[PDB]
Structure formats: C-alpha cells, structure tokens
Amino acid sequence: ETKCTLKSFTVEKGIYQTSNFRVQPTESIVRFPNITNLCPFDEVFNATTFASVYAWNRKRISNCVADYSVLYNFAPFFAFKCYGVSPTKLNDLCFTNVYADSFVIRGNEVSQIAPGQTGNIADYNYKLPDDFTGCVIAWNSNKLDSKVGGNYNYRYRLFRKSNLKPFERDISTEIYQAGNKPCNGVAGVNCYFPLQSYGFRPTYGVGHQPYRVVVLSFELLHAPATVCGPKKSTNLVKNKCVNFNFNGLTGTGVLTESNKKFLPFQQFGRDIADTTDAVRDPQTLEILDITP
Amino acid sequence: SYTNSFTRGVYYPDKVFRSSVLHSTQDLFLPFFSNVTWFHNPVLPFNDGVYFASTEKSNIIRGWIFGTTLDSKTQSLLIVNNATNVVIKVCEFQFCNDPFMESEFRVYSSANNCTFEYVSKNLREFVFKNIDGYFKIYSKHTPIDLPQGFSALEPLVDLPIGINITRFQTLLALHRSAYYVGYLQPRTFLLKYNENGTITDAVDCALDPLS
Numbered sequence: 421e422t423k424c425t426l427k428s429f430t431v432e433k434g435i436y437q438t439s440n441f442r443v444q445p446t447e448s449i450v451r452f453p454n455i456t457n458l459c460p461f462d463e464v465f466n467a468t469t470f471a472s473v474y475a476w477n478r479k480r481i482s483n484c485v486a487d488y489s490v491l492y493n494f495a496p497f498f499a500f501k502c503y504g505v506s507p508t509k510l511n512d513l514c515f516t517n518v519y520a521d522s523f524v525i526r527g528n529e530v531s532q533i534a535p536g537q538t539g540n541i542a543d544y545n546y547k548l549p550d551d552f553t554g555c556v557i558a559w560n561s562n563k564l565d566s567k568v569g570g571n572y573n574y575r576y577r578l579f580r581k582s583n584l585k586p587f588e589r590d591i592s593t594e595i596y597q598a599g600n601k602p603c604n605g606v607a608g609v610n611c612y613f614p615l616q617s618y619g620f621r622p623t624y625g626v627g628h629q630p631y632r633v634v635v636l637s638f639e640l641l642h643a644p645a646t647v648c649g650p651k652k653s654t655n656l657v658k659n660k661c662v663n664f665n666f667n668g669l670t671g672t673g674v675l676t677e678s679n680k681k682f683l684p685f686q687q688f689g690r691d692i693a694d695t696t697d698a699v700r701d702p703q704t705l706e707i708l709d710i711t712p
Numbered sequence: 713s714y715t716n717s718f719t720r721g722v723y724y725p726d727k728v729f730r731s732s733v734l735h736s737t738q739d740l741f742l743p744f745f746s747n748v749t750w751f752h753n754p755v756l757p758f759n760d761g762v763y764f765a766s767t768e769k770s771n772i773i774r775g776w777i778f779g780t781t782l783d784s785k786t787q788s789l790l791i792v793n794n795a796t797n798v799v800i801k802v803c804e805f806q807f808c809n810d811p812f813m814e815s816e817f818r819v820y821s822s823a824n825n826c827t828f829e830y831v832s833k834n835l836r837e838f839v840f841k842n843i844d845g846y847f848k849i850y851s852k853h854t855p856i857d858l859p860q861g862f863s864a865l866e867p868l869v870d871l872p873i874g875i876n877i878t879r880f881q882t883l884l885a886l887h888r889s890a891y892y893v894g895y896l897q898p899r900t901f902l903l904k905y906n907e908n909g910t911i912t913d914a915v916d917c918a919l920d921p922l923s
C-alpha cells in the first residue's frame with residue numbers, strides 16, 4: 421500500500437500516510453414517538469345497532485393515529501376492496517380526515533357500493549362518486565341482525581323523483597306521486613310509501629342475509645400535519661457505532677448515558693458550531709450523548 | 713394610556729437544550745423599550761403575534777377569543793377558564809359584541825360545526841403566534857403598570873388548526889356580588905444561555921450603536 425501510494429517500487433526511509441481507518445456501523449435503529457391518541461375504530465365497527473340505508477350514520481375521525489392492522493388482520497370480511505390506495509401501504513400515506521359511513525344492506529347488493537354503479541341502492545340511497553379515494557369493506561352479520569319472525573327496522577328506500585348526487589342524504593318521507601292526480605299525502609292508487617323495510621330472517625339464503633358495511637373515505641385538502649399511520653421505535657442500543665433515527669433526527673454515532681439536564685420541553689442539544697450532540701429518548705425521556 | 717416595556721417578551725425560539733452560548737436568532741420579537749397600550753374590553757388587531765401581560769390576585773382575565781370575524785360564517789378559536797379549568801374550543805360561534813350564584817358565560821350564543829374541542833400579586837405573560845396552521849402559545853407566571861426585569865417565556869401549547877386570524881379580544885369576570893398589548897416584529901436578538909440552559913439576558917441588536 422505504501423508502494424502504491426508513492427507510485428514506486430523502492431520506498432526510502434520515512435513515514436508515509438497510506439490510508440484511513442473508519443469503524444463500521446451495523447443495523448439502523450429508527451426511534452419515534454408512541455401512538456397515544458389513536459383512531460377509536462372499536463366503535464364504528466362494533467356498535468350494537470347499525471343504522472339504516474336511507475339514513476346512514478357518518479362519523480368523522482379527528483387528528484389521531486390510525487392502526488389499520490387491527491381491521492386488516494381480524495376477521496373473515498366477505499368483501500374487502502380498496503380503490504384509490506393500495507391496501508397494504510395504508511401506513512405511509514395519510515390525509516386530513518377520514519369518514520366511516522355505515523349501514524345494513526342485503527347480500528346481493530354489496531356489489532353496488534362502488535364508483536360507477538346503478539341499482540336501487542346506488543341511485544336512490546347511497547351514491548359513491550366516480551373519483552373515490554377511500555376503501556370499502558363489508559362482512560356478514562346473519563347471527564346478530566336477524567330475528568326469527570322478521571326484523572322490520574331496516575328500511576331501504578326504493579322511490580325517488582331523481583337520482584341522488586354523490587354523497588347526499590335524503591330522509592324525507594313524502595308520498596311518491598306516480599300518476600298525474602295529486603294525493604295530498606295519503607296512500608291509495610298511484611301513490612306509494614317510499615320505504616320498503618327488509619324482512620330479515622335467519623333461514624334465508626346467502627345474498628338475502630344482512631351484510632353490514634363500512635366505507636372509509638380519505639380527504640387531503642390543504643392540512644400540513646394531520647392524522648397519520650403508525651411508525652416504529654426499535655430498541656435503543658448503547659456503546660456501539662449505530663445508525664439512529666430519533667423522531668426525525670437522523671444520525672450516526674455511539675450513544676451513551678448522559679448526566680446533563682435539559683429543560684422539560686427540550687428534545688436535543690447542540691454544540692457551538694451547531695452539531696447535535698445530545699438527544700432525549702421519547703419513550704423513557706432520558707438524555708443520551710452522541711459521540712462520533 | 714400607554715406604557716414602556718423594558719426587556720419583556722423573550723421566549724425560547726424552540727426546543728433543543730443549550731448552555732452558556734450567546735446564540736444569535738432572527739425571529740418575531742417584541743422590541744425592547746416599546747410602546748405598549750394600557751387597558752383598565754374592545755376588539756384589537758393581531759397582524760403578527762401578540763404579547764399580553766396582566767396582574768391581579770383574583771382572576772378577572774378569563775381567556776381570550778380569536779379569529780377574523782368573531783362570529784359565524786367563518787371559524788374562530790375560543791379559550792376560556794371558568795373556576796374549574798381551561799377550555800380550548802374551535803367552532804363557528806355567535807359572539808356577543810360585548811362578551812363576558814356565581815353564574816356566568818354570556819360569551820356566545822352558538823357553537824356550530826366544532827372542529828376541535830378540549831376540556832379538563834401575580835404577573836402572567838403570554839405570547840401568541842400563528843404560523844403554518846399552527847397556533848403557538850408561550851407563557852410565564854412571575855409573581856411580585858408593569859415593572860422592570862428579565863424573564864423568558866416557555867412554550868405551552870401547539871394547535872394544528874388551520875384557522876385564519878385577524879382580530880382578538882379579552883374576557884372578564886363581572887362585578888355582581890389592568891392589561892397590556894404589544895405586537896411582534898421580525899428582529900434579531902442575541903440570547904445569553906446559562907449553564908442549566910435558561911436564557912438569563914438578551915440584546916436587541918437594533919437599539920443603539922452598542923447593540
């Protein structure tokens with residue numbers, strides 16, 4: 421190596437700088453913060469009573485952390501299709517707010533909850549715009565929402581003067597006028613009641629049994645920091661040249677127990693000439709020095 | 713009337729510990745020896761942050777209200793404190809033009825479309841600022857017309873609202889049985905850090921040739 425550095429075959433006595441020694445770092449520890457305020461998905465999926473189709477319950481989710489690994493890994497889920505976003509990477513792209521609509525429709529009508537569909541459900545009760553971005557889910561609930569003798573509390577509407585617009589709701593109960601003679605709000609001939617409650621029973625066939633539905637839909641208008649998915653904070657090692665990532669602070673070096681005392685709102689410390697030389701561990705809240 | 717701050721309205725520009733290091737910053741500060749209004753109440757402007765001190769052993773100052781119109785048709789913030797504890801809130805309101813047993817709260821008459829909730833002598837300083845949809849609040853409580861001294865203000869809150877602000881007010885507890893307002897401008901300061909990491913002194917670098 422000396423002969424190569426000098427470009428010769430005879431080196432005379434001396435002392436020669438030949439190269440450099442640089443310790444090597446192994447593994448990459450990515451630190452971060454908890455989840456804390458998270459998405460209370462345990463309510464929109466587990467309420468004891470779900471709404472009806474003509475009047476669907478819309479619950480919004482504020483700024484939290486969303487753990488979709490609870491819904492993806494949980495249950496049979498007879499249908500699960502996500503349209504704008506790929507179902508797997510739901511943890512790296514986040515949006516301003518999510519909404520979770522819910523209802524109870526029939527089995528053979530689940531295929532109507534999709535962008536660009538037609539039918540008694542997609543034209544009169546719940547219409548999804550063609551520019552959908554969320555992701556639909558639906559599962560069977562025959563053992564809960566079905567009583568022997570008929571369950572007459574679910575009330576899809578089947579008559580309306582015009583097709584619904586995307587994401588509208590109509591709970592009016594006026595009498596539909598079919599003919600040309602007004603009926604002044606009473607049933608009779610050519611005037612009908614526009615609600616046609618399902619006759620749910622346990623001894624039905626698949627395609628006529630109740631199927632609960634949840635429709636997550638995402639929106640990102642202009643908010644810079646919003647609800648987002650969860651990340652990670654690998655265990656923290658010490659006394660080894662490591663590649664570390666403190667809730668944003670990316671660096672390399674040896675980590676060591678400190679004996680300085682930050683003020684209880686300061687995250688990391690800097691030197692003169694402005695280099696990060698101490699951090700605080702988010703989870704345990706202890707100060708650690710960073711030496712190269 | 714009007715009064716003169718002396719060296720007031722210094723806050724820690726951010727996290728990151730620090731010790732003896734005359735560190736230099738550019739930010740929005742309240743210039744030294746400024747012209748601060750005196751109040752013994754009306755709609756004020758905001759325009760770029762606000763310094764706000766007060767004094768009273770009882771608690772007459774019971775929070776502020778912010779926004780552009782202080783009514784419906786646009787959103788606003790509301791920060792309140794009954795004898796219980798603080799209540800931050802963000803809806804569209806309908807605010808009394810003069811909003812203010814022990815029964816109270818003639819403040820608003822509407823709470824629509826709420827997009828954020830939260831529930832739970834003396835000198836009490838506050839610095840309010842609003843950058844990139846975040847509404848930052850620094851504060852300090854030092855106990856004994858203002859006096860003369862140095863005391864740096866530590867960050868309290870952070871709210872990712874998005875709200876626009878152009879005006880603000882105050883809230884007071886009536887009688888049935890003193891406060892100042894500075895404004896902040898882009899200045900350059902030189903902060904002296906202690907060995908524990910606290911700001912003990914400062915220099916406003918636009919005062920006199922010495923600075």
Ligand SMILES: *[C@@H]1O[C@H](CO)[C@@H](O[C@@H]2O[C@H](CO)[C@@H](O)[C@H](O)[C@H]2NC(C)=O)[C@H](O)[C@H]1NC(C)=O
Pocket residue numbers: 462465466494
């Ligand atoms: C939906 O709610 C039910 C009841 O509230 C949950 O059933 C509970 O499951 C846990 C875990 O096995 C048990 O310890 C409880 O005893 C169960 N509750 C009852 C009343 O027996 C169910 O886990 C919830 N489902 C989801 C997805 O959260």
Ligand SMILES: *[C@@H]1O[C@H](CO)[C@@H](O[C@@H]2O[C@H](CO)[C@@H](O)[C@H](O)[C@H]2NC(C)=O)[C@H](O)[C@H]1NC(C)=O
Pocket residue numbers: 454702703704
């Ligand atoms: C983030 O979560 C961790 C655990 O996942 C919390 O660590 C706990 O800290 C308390 C100290 O008050 C210990 O008594 C617990 O034993 C810790 N738990 C574990 C599993 O180690 C940590 O406190 C959380 N962050 C915050 C800010 O509270």
Ligand SMILES: *[C@@H]1O[C@H](CO)[C@@H](O)[C@H](O)[C@H]1NC(C)=O
Pocket residue numbers: 714715716746747
């Ligand atoms: C503050 O400005 C007003 C504006 O007219 C002026 O009258 C007053 O003297 C000023 N106060 C000081 C302390 O300079």
Ligand SMILES: *[C@@H]1O[C@H](CO)[C@@H](O)[C@H](O)[C@H]1NC(C)=O
Pocket residue numbers: 792794796797799831
């Ligand atoms: C204090 O005011 C808040 C404002 O809504 C209210 O929620 C709370 O109940 C009040 N305290 C008591 C004891 O009522």
Ligand SMILES: *[C@@H]1O[C@H](CO)[C@@H](O)[C@H](O)[C@H]1NC(C)=O
Pocket residue numbers: 824825
């Ligand atoms: C805000 O409230 C008004 C009146 O209550 C309502 O018309 C409007 O839809 C609300 N905003 C949203 C986004 O729903």
Ligand SMILES: *[C@@H]1O[C@H](CO)[C@@H](O)[C@H](O)[C@H]1NC(C)=O
Pocket residue numbers: 874875876
């Ligand atoms: C605040 O008001 C200005 C008026 O010039 C407007 O252009 C701006 O869009 C408003 N802020 C937001 C976040 O919309």
Ligand SMILES: *[C@@H]1O[C@H](CO)[C@@H](O)[C@H](O)[C@H]1NC(C)=O
Pocket residue numbers: 906907908
């Ligand atoms: C804080 O600073 C004082 C004086 O600068 C020093 O005596 C003390 O040890 C420091 N630490 C404390 C009070 O925890």
